[PDB]
Amino acid sequence: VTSEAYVSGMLFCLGIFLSFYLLTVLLACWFWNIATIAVFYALPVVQLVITYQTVVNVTGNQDICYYNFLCAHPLGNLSAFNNILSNLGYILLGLLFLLIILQREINHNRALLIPKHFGLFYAMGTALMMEGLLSACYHVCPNYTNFQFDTSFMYMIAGLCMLKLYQKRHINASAYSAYACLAIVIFFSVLGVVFGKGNTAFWIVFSIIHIIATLLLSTQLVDRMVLLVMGNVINWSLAAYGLIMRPNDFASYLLAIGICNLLLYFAFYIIMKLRSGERIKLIPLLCIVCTSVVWGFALFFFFQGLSTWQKTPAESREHNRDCILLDFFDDHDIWHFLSSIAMFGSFLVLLTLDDDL
Amino acid sequence: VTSEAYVSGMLFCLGIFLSFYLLTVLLACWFWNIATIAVFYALPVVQLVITYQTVVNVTGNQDICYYNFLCAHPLGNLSAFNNILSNLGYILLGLLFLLIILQREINHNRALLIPKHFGLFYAMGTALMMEGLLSACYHVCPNYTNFQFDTSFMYMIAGLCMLKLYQKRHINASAYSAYACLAIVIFFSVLGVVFGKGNTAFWIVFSIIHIIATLLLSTQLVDRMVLLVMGNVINWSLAAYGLIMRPNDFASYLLAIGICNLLLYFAFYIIMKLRSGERIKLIPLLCIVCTSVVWGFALFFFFQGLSTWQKTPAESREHNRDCILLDFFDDHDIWHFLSSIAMFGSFLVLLTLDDDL
């Protein structure tokens, strides 16, 4: 491809994210526990990517990294520059969550001169920026040994989102455990997935754990009892689909479980708000819809399965598909563009949810 | 070598460590923060070792793992079974630290029916057992990408040892930071060591950091002021030796720094105890000598440099040396046998230090 496509791809990416900065300025005119934990986690992964990428460059063997070889545009020593550039949204849009919460915080403090706790919002903010660093470093050379943290970080942010929801009636102690508990889950998944080919035991044990975990989570949290029963029933239905069909790896299923439960959890809080006399303001109501519709495609684009690290590298090249957007970006890049906006709307639902009170 | 040497090596290893169990029975007749932190750290390292070891077995290329090929005895699919078996002391002798502290704890509770806090001793106990798992897993296939945690864990235990010393006048909050701070130091070392060949900047920046860190540590902690000045002077002398000579990698130096400072820190507490009217009991006085003499050889055996991951694998094979002990164990194995006992005596110095009061 020509260098113009590079310029068009850069201008398109910057144009989308700078439009949110312009919109927030027009509207205005009208802690480190999670950061330290994955700094422990990401850095050993960072070295492996650099070491493996150098091997591919000098050895000539292209069976190491699980790229999208039909559409992967290089620059310098990098083999897929578009896949690294696709995460630019996490940095710019994730940072934009800091100014909006900080602008609220300074307005709150000036005015003083629903519980108010802006600390956890900053934790989600630096969590989204750590996408733009680690998820960029992962894509330099994707591999099984280096896979998990590209999508495991999504769960950490997803869990934190859940924590503030639980903090509706009330944070620091549970945040460390949530990052710590999810770190354990990542490796417990890796241990079972070592024998992933024909892992019938994991197909059953995970379902039993899933049923037990949902009940305990429901128990810890008439309308509530009936509502959690329905959530358990559909959760068992999704697990039954995973146990019966088994069309993708467990890794695809875990991300599928988290987003649907989050959307269910997002929806459920509205049910209490809708059943009660409280009326949802226009902004959260649009935001809930706007967040949900964007999460719709993001799930659709994730289930495409461009590359598979379950099988041999020769078999994974079967699922490569050419660039679709501006002849520079592929389906996984569209996932980054849409998972960034979907998560941005996910926060803005939380920030503006209880403003009516 | 014949299978007898396997039997003699197993009986020798078990005979040494079971002698401590017999001795403790004869004498008697006469939390999870650190555990969770490196479970996050060790497991990604565990996968890399298994993945790399399988590659060596099937590819035939022996340039991946930095073994001691002159003396490395296989069993099953494992390439150096003696190096894995050498860590057996950490499990048996490290576990022995749990019974002695638990036997004291149950005696303390029965009698009740110097501050008493047995929790941190349990943390050191499970730290020593985590040597027997991770340091065993590391030696299955040693490599640069997997190097750090084999000796980085020593620092964590070393730091905890320091914490109880600081707890003389008084724990949980600092333990997490100490493990967290050391996790950062590991990767900050790895980042600089990427350009280790001719890293003149790291040769100077580390010395300045070393000088600043010692002063701040001294400041946080007439006799005290003069004593810390002498400790700083000799610490600057060791750094000056590292900056001038540069005969080994930084990795060898960092372990050298920790043990000497620990022994200095061990010695210094005696100076306050000796200057004061308190008289050291016979057991700690022998234990201080017995711990120190064993740490003497352990430093000597560590500086041998059997394998070097700084250079190419062809150059590292130059420093291989045959088995010395029972035709089964090499110098690094003797390090494991002596670093286990030296650390066991290191704890027993702490446990029995303040019994006279």
- Chain B residue closest to A147 (CA)? B44
Amino acid identity for residue B320 in this structure:
N
| CA gap A188, B44 in Å, rounded | 11
CA A123, CA B67: separation in Å to the nearest integer? 43
Spatial distance between the Cα atoms of A224 and B326, rounded to a whole number of angstroms: 69
Three-point CA angle B14, B16, B18, nearest 5°:
60
Closest to A229 measured CA to CA, from A245, A211, A246: A211
Query: How many whole angstroms separate alpha carbon B339 and alpha carbon A17?
Result: 56
Report CB contact under 8 Å: B40, A180. yes
Q: List for chain B the helix, strand, coil content (%; round to 5).
A: 75, 0, 25
Residues of A in contact with B182 (CB under 8 A): none
A246 φψ region: left (φ > 0), alpha (ψ -120 to 50), beta (else) = left
- For helices A223-244 and A250-275, the axis angle rounded to 10 degrees is 160
- Would an 8 Å CB–CB cutoff place B184 in contact with chain A? yes
A40 and B43 within 8 Å at the Cβ level: the answer is: no
Rounded CA separation B107/B101 (Å): 10
Q: Which of A345, A336, A318, A321 is nearest to A124 (CA)?
A: A345
Return the SS3 of B303.
Answer: coil
CB-CB contact of A293 with A128 (8 Å): no
For residues A5 and A71, the answer to whether their CB atoms sit within 8 Å is no
Q: DSSP letter for A310, please.
A: S
Cβ(B161)–Cβ(B346) below 8 Å: yes
Resolution of this model in Å is 3.3
By the 8 A CB rule, do B208 and B201 touch? Answer: no
Report residue B203 as tokens: 């040769």
CB-CB neighbours of A351 under 10 Å: 19
**Could you give the CA distance from residue B239 to residue B246 in angstroms, rounded to a whole number?**
10
Burial degree of A189 (CB within 10 A; 0-12, 13-18, 19+): middle
What distance in Å separates the CA atoms of residue A59 and residue A261, rounded to the nearest whole number?
44
Beta carbons of B281 and B356 less than 8 angstroms apart = yes
Distance of CA A82 to the CA centre of its chain: 19
The answer to whether B41 contacts A40, with C-beta atoms less than 8 Å apart, is: yes
Residue B319 is given by DSSP the state G
What distance in Å separates the CA atoms of residue A236 and residue B283, rounded to the nearest whole number? 62
Dihedrals φ, ψ of A110, to 5°?
A: -65, -40
| A:B CB pairs within 8 Å | 54
**Closest by Cα among B335, B336, B333, B338 to B73:** B333
Distance CA A49, CA A46 (A): 5
CA distances for B218 relative to A65, B223, B275, B350, angstroms: 48, 13, 19, 21
Note whether B41 contacts A44, CB cutoff 8 Å: yes
State how far the Cα of A313 lies from the Cα of A63, in Å rounded to an integer. 6
d(C-alpha A329, C-alpha A302), whole Å = 14
The answer to whether the Cβ–Cβ distance between A180 and B43 falls below 8 Å is: no
Nearest to A38 by CA among A251, A190, A183, A186: A183
Q: In this structure, what token pair is assigned to residue A285? A: 């109501």
Distances (CA, A) of A238 to A260, A301, B213: 10, 19, 54
Classify A75 as helix, strand or coil.
strand
- Rounded distance, CA B66 to CA B57, Å? 14
B321 vs B304: CA distance, rounded Å: 10
B243 in A contact zone (CB under 8 Å): no
> What does the H/E/C string look like for chain B?
CCHHHHHHHHHHHHHHHHHHHHHHHHHHHCCCHHHHHHHHHHHHHHHHHHHHHHHHHHHCCCCCCCCCCCCCCCECCECCHHHHHCCHHHHHHHHHHHHHHHHHHHHHHHHHCCCCCCHHHHHHHHHHHHHHHHHHHHCCCCCCCCCCHHHHHHHHHHHHHHHHHHCCCCCHHHHHHHHHHHHHHHHHHHHHHCCCCCCHHHHHHHHHHHHHHHHHHHHHCCHHHHHHHHHHHHHHHHHHHHHHCCCCCHHHHHHHHHHHHHHHHHHHHHHHHHHCCCCCCHHHHHHHHHHHHHHHHHHHHHCCCCCCCCCCHHHHHHHCCCCCECCCECHHHHHHHHHHHHHHHHHHHHHCCCCCC
* CB within 8 Å: A40 and B145: no
Taking a C-beta distance cutoff of 8 angstroms, is the pair B166, B90 a contact? no
Q: Which tokens in the block code for residue A236?
A: 């068992």
User: Across the interface, which of A36, A50, A184 has its CB nearest the CB of B180?
Assistant: A36
Are the C-beta atoms of residues B306 and B319 closer than 8 Å to each other? yes
Residues forming a β-bridge with B325: B329
Cα angle A78-A84-A89, degrees, rounded to a multiple of 5: 155
Q: What's the rounded Cα separation, in Å, for the pair A25 and A12?
A: 20
Name residue B75's beta-bridge partners: B78
Nearest CB to A184 within list B39, B144, B183? B39
Please state, in angstroms and as integers, the Cα–Cα distance from residue A241 to each residue in A47, A193, A202, A295, B339, following that order: 38, 19, 14, 21, 53
Residue A160 in contact with residue A123, Cβ under 8 Å? Answer: yes
CA angle A311–A43–B340, rounded 5-degree value: 100
How far is Cα A67 from Cα B20, in angstroms, rounded to an integer? 55
- CA angle in degrees (0–180, nearest 5) for B114-B119-B125: 115
Question: Do A179 and A120 touch, CB atoms closer than 8 A?
Answer: no
Q: Provide the 3-class DSSP secondary structure of residue A294.
A: helix
Q: Distance between CA A64 and CA B309 in Å, rounded?
A: 22
Task: At A9, list the tokens.
Answer: 């791809």
Only one residue has tokens 């358990």, namely A232
Experimental method: cryo-EM
CA distance B231 to B217: 11
CA distances from A276 to A221, A269, A280 (A): 18, 11, 10
In the numeric block, the tokens 């070295």 are attached to: A47
Q: Measuring CA to CA, which residue among A66, A3, A12 is closest to residue A324?
A: A12
Is B151 within 8 Å of B63 (Cβ atoms)?
A: no
Smallest CA–CA distance, residue A145 to chain B, in Å, is 7
Do the beta carbons of residue B329 and residue B86 sit within 8 Å? yes
- What is d(CA A304, CA B112) in angstroms, rounded to the nearest whole number? 66
CA contacts within 13 A on the Cβ side of A126: 13
| Selection from B54, B79, B81, B77 nearest residue B66 by Cα | B79
In B285-318, which positions are buried (b, 16+ CB within 10 angstroms) versus exposed (e)? eebbebbbebbeebbebbeeebbbbeeebeebbe
Q: First vs last Cα of chain B: how many Å apart?
A: 54
Token pair, residue B331, equals 């110098």
d(CA B126, CA B35): 7
CA angle A310, A315, A319 (to 5 degrees): 90
Which helix (H) or strand (E) segment is A254 a member of?
A: helix A250-275
